[PDB]
Design a protein around this ligand. Sequence first.
Ligand code: PLP
Ligand code: PLP
Ligand code: PLP
Ligand code: PLP
Ligand code: CL
Ligand code: CL
Ligand code: CL
Ligand code: CL
Lengths: 470, 471, 467, 458
Amino acid sequence: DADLWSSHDKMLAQPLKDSDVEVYNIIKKESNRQRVGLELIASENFASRAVLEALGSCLNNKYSEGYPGQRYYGGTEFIDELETLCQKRALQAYKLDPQCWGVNVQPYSGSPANFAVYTALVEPNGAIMGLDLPDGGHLTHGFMTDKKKISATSIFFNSMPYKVNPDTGYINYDQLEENARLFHPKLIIAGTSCYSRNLEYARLRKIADENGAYLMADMAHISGLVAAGVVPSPFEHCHVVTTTTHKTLRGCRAGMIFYRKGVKSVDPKTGKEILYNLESLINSAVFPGLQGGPHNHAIAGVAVALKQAMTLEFKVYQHQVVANCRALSEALTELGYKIVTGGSDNHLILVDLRSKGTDGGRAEKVLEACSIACNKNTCPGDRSALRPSGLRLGTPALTSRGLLEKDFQKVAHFIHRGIELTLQIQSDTGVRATLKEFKERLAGDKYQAAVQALREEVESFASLFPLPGL
Amino acid sequence: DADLWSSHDKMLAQPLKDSDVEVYNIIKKESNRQRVGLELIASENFASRAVLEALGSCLNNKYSEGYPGQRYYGGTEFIDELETLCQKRALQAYKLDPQCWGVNVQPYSGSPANFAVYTALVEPNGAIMGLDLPDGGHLTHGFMTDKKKISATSIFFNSMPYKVNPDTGYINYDQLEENARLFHPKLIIAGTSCYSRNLEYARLRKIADENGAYLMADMAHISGLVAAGVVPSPFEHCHVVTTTTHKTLRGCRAGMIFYRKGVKSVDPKTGKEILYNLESLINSAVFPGLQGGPHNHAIAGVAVALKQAMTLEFKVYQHQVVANCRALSEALTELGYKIVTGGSDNHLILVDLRSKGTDGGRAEKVLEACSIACNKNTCPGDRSALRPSGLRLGTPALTSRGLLEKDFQKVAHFIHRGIELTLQIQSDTGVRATLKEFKERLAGDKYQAAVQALREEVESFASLFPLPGLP
Amino acid sequence: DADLWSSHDKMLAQPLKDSDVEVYNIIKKESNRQRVGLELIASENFASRAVLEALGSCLNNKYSEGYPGQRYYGGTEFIDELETLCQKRALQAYKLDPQCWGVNVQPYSGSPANFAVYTALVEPNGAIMGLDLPDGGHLTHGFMTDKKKISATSIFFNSMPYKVNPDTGYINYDQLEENARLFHPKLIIAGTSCYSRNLEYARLRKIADENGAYLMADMAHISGLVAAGVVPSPFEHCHVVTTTTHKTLRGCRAGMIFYRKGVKSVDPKTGKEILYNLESLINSAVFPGLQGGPHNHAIAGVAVALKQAMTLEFKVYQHQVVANCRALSEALTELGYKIVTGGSDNHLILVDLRSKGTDGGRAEKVLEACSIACNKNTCPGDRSALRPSGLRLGTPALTSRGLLEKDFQKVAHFIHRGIELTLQIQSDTATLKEFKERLAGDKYQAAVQALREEVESFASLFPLPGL
Amino acid sequence: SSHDKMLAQPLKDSDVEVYNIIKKESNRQRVGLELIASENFASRAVLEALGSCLNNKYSEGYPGQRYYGGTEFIDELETLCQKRALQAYKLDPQCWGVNVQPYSGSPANFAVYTALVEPNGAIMGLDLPDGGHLTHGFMTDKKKISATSIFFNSMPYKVNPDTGYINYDQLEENARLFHPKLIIAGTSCYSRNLEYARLRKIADENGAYLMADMAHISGLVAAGVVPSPFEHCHVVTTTTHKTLRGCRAGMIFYRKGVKSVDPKTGKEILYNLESLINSAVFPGLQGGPHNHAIAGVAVALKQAMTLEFKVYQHQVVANCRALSEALTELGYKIVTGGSDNHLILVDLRSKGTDGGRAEKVLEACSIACNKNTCPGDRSALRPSGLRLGTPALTSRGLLEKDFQKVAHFIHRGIELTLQIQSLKEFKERLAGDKYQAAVQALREEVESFASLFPLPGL
Ligand SMILES: *Cc1c(COP(=O)(O)O)cnc(C)c1O
Ligand SMILES: *Cc1c(COP(=O)(O)O)cnc(C)c1O
Ligand SMILES: *Cc1c(COP(=O)(O)O)cnc(C)c1O
Ligand SMILES: *Cc1c(COP(=O)(O)O)cnc(C)c1O
Ligand SMILES: [Cl-]
Ligand SMILES: [Cl-]
Ligand SMILES: [Cl-]
Ligand SMILES: [Cl-]
């Protein structure tokens, strides 16, 4: 009668360690894996303990549909404080005048953030233009084939990508300007998932204005860098700025949408000023358009992250991020590796392994087997996305642990050694060998000691640094 | 040189309490606010500590785009174990045969989960039919006006709602079957945000098959009940079942999508069997269609919740949820309140305040001022959505704290006293008064003591019960 | 060198009779077929010789893209007179104040005319409501199935039809009003292909305004009647009126689009009167949106037809059209045939053959074999559009030849005899394939011939407009 | 009583007002020099067919698939027409089919899109200012103007402003990005032959359809004066007037039979254009066919298979050269100096003026032609070129020597234009009193020359 009811009350108060050992262990194993591993995936990073604590707060429970002042349900005086605070810090972090800029912090993640904007400004079967996927774009910028639309962006809207110049490795802004005149985009996307150089926002803006389109920036990857002022801000030229709250920003998984406010343009003769209406449209698209109940526990984490983002320690961190990157870049350069575009203005670099006579697809799996985390990526000029020639390497992940130039140079050597091992297996399994067979020879018995020998040395090195979290 | 670099390392390992007192205090205030208040919002509930500890895990860091064995990035052997485990438990919680059913657990929340399905199955400007918003539907089921499409569902797809019978209060399935033949839906939604009775899924399935459409169930609200077997399962008749992982399920904020697998139909003559292709379509729609990197930390929280959901304590909980609702319902009934449809087969009820001579819009604000959390809602027969007559009251939130029949009856009294105070203020401020003026008189000095008197008594009563997941 | 160049000049000036005997013969055969046949298809009629002469004019050559004074090419002073005249007459025919009403006369036909309006006013994937197809609607009013969108209207625009009350036979305006509040139509269509009663335009207007939609009337089938004032005008309540120039109007194949002009409403507070903008939108949609170079030769025929439509002879014609319809109706009623809705306010009627124990699909083919031209059509309450129960019978065609009440009663008898032959064939034998076969059979051929010859010999007694 | 007379009364009596307008136009066409490429004079045989009782018969559907009965004679007609259509272009009935119901050329194209591309699908065509046609797609930074652009996705390909030739290289490049479903090989104002083989290669590479719009060259291709697009294209749309000298109507030719085969399984995949395209015309877009037009078309198709027509089409091309070089030698700059077809595009910047002004002056002199933007024009509001075609006049009996005398009459108009020039104000000065005698003096001399030739029709 009341024996089991007490057990119920005990259940909701019971610690994870006891309640779910099965899941508890998986988290422990992952925590370990992250610790002994070298993280070089550009989109990776380690959240602060302060942010993680906010995610476990009672803020999960409160359903606060709508916005501060326009709430559907009542009893939100504290959620209002939080959401209002978060967006106040968001504007501060990027030095934005509240009268010139507004921000929406409800987006569940980065992808939903972008889609909300399209839905709001472009509208069904509208025209969008973004960096091609194999050229360093992101799916949310549109992606389709001769057979079908794959990305949601491509499905409901009409996309046609602009490309990078295969020779220089830089974005071909000239061709974009030309195609834009024939396609008449409604919105142009200024952002990249795998691009190692600063975007010419001023140039793009002009191209957008020429065609009467919006300029949306997706600073997902460089959000941390722009905040610290380590890289040129896109806010000066863009109309809308979408961003993820994780990656270089080191927040929890969430998204944000910055939009212009105030005067859009004026009539020379009548003096009648036309004001921006992005605030209304964008907000309406997030709710009640797409999303429902805001994830207040995440908004908190974001708010916490934004405070840390405005500290000097962060500013230093972001500079060290870039500094490390050049160290890693030149270290590999001097080793004979062809960096795409000959260096990086930001945190990441794209290594074209054709320089060593191999591809990223095979190098990826080998590096992984050695606790070296990174991802393959197609290089400018690749005639096949199935066999990518390059590897994407970012520094923000390791930098957060305390890695410095000298260390990233030691990492560079570990990476090379992985490529080496790759070239051995590649030559051993023949030339007409498939990726299927390569994976088998790798996990094979012949190279089992070699892989382990490196892995153990990589792990022992990573173990020397702290792992933010706990 | 190295003085500030050490401070950097200290910052990432620094506790929230020290790192951000400003946010830390807001959380404490909220945590205190939830404690002393009676939560009666149907969609509300309290997550278990175990779940809350999973969200703060290092799982936040790993980017695992794709699905188990189909991952874009490497080093996911532990994320795979987690995602594979979660979805295995998901199928178990609802006693589903893995050969007959599959599930995607990546959706960031409920809404994204629904939109994912439409994208995959219905496709741009396809026809969708759902319960009307003011009749207890949800925005994601579609909503528009004579002037614009408001819901993303309506914006990108061609939607037309089906309505509840204003007299009885039950969904008018007959009109639906009729309009369906005209509209030719490609998919019909069997779900509600504010409905107090069990859906006739069998009926709906027939109507769907007649027009060659899919039947998608949105068990967001009754997900918990269905799991414990307290309410008839929609899995028997529907093709797809979307759900939120919170509310009655008591998980963290996230969504799931269940889809049919195996044989769809067979040719009587040729014997050639056609198989379902929902798995591929739905999965492709979630990724790389709509979402990006899975929120693994939430996927863990869902997994944890799903294990608790399969326990006997949960089963008892859910039974107590419904039991409490009947107690609250009949308690208000006996006080003369008109419950829409005269009761409820589930956790929530819809109280029509026209019975006491007022509206939900005003009662909402008064009850709130007294720490009585609930939301207004239009009743069947309301000629104006600006002045809703009804209140939505749910029991899952309080029942989680430990409330029982007898307690919910006491709550029923406290609520009544709230309606009373509402009636006094309503008559005091006149009849032609606006909601604007009402709010002012409420917060006014004349009723400042009355409100406080009730508030303090409610909070003192609310304090007697525990609150899940603290320090 | 110049021997064949002379032949070329001879070719262009050579008569059809000589230039293309093959085609010349087909025309003669058809002309004959029409002469000896009894035309009872509601959408049919016979154009005046005057109109037919206009179609062969040199107006075929001029390319006059755009509108009067807004032409893309020059040298259109005479085309401008024509088009301007035509639309001037169009407004007169329906007693429409030019300040309150405008009209576009370029549409190649009725369907394009309708689509032109949707593209202009409704816009891609915009809601549209019309009478359901099997209930007497038209394809252009929207039509779809579970499998697919079939009509262009349905493919590009959201369409959801309203239905006729299966019991009474009248349109169910109540259900429309109800579904309208859910669907939120941008444009409602008040027109019918197979409907025997006057539309409650006032009622429909109220429903349209309630949902802030446009009321578009498709008077294709009643354009002639409304012109003569035999039937209540849709112009008093509608925002836009589309119409074909043939059928009851006895013009050549073409379409027109009438639209409201002037003040739409006057805002209460501001007081700034808001004006209609249909003229621009609709015109823009016809060109340069949808169509290209106008078919001035048809625009002439239309103009000619419109002048004839304003004569007393025409007025008497249309009255006689309705008169004949009543006679035909009651003549079949008295023979026991069930007329859907029990009569007709206009030119056509729907005969429910279930009263005789058969279907339209089986009666159509028999009647055809007897030179009796008519078409099958689903009755209200038909559970299968594959086996339609009714026949659609119209008077405008024969009436033009000179047929009168007494004659249409003799026609009624001829029709009944066709139904008998149908029933007798139906009794012996089954799928339609088997039926058609039995009809072409060895024993009913005579009975049929006995009828055909008698029908033809009767039709042969009346003049055939054209030549 | 009197009503029976009315339906049998002649137009001359029934409607004098309309009757006169027709006479005035017939006169105007007789005394004017028609040089609009899209113009032509239909034979008297075709015109008589348009007035036939065929106007009355509603024959919805296709032969053997009709909705209404009593169509045995319409079936013969429509079947004959499409039989002749295939003969005219030497097309094997097993390899090719044709739909002859389209009310005009524009509807013909749209039908194809509706059938193959499917709503919000991607098509590509020559840019409008580069000599494309509206139906091939046309939009701006502000709105979609052409029906094609509205319901579908269009992204045009351009002509090389330097050479004047279509830039196939850039098309091949952009195509890889836009993923067209259908590419359009057709022009309204393009002076050279299309590289269909090339286009086909580009289409196959992207897995698209190759639709040819031979509206302007339909007559030329029929006679074999110009390379046929049927050898490389999947679908061929066309108008039945213009160079074909039929009444206003359209046709749609489509491939039939085997599309491709599987090397291993030997399983052959067959084309399905016939069904889709037909279904799109009806019951998709159109309603009751215009049988009176279908007859005229059939008549024209017979004339198109005669030797007299063949000669005509060659004289058409021949005249064009004579006119091209006659203006070349007078110092005028022809874009792509030389034409492989009936029309040419005269760039008036070589004479220090624009087409927009020359058009209005030439018109005032009974010289019919139209302005058109040249490759390299930075403003479509001030077009630099004039489009001049020979099929119209050639049909009257005009020969090389005559078109040279025409070339002189045209030049004199350009002079008169340059005098007035040294657009609103220009029009006023033209109609002004100062140049009233000069215009009349040339007009009377132009008209007196045209009067010397016969006018097909009556
Ligand atoms: C709550 C709910 C959802 C999901 O809402 P989110 O706040 O986006 O998780 C979906 N459907 C229904 C019927 C609901 O009640
Ligand atoms: C990572 C990323 C996003 C957001 O990804 P989520 O996993 O959905 O948070 C958005 N845009 C770009 C360019 C990105 O690289
Ligand atoms: C006949 C008809 C049309 C037009 O038909 P066409 O054969 O295309 O001229 C349009 N609407 C209605 C209601 C009709 O009956
Ligand atoms: C003229 C033309 C058409 C058809 O024009 P209509 O005015 O509709 O007869 C079609 N395509 C092209 C390329 C043309 O030049
Ligand atoms: Cl990424
Ligand atoms: Cl809700
Ligand atoms: Cl009809
Ligand atoms: Cl043209």
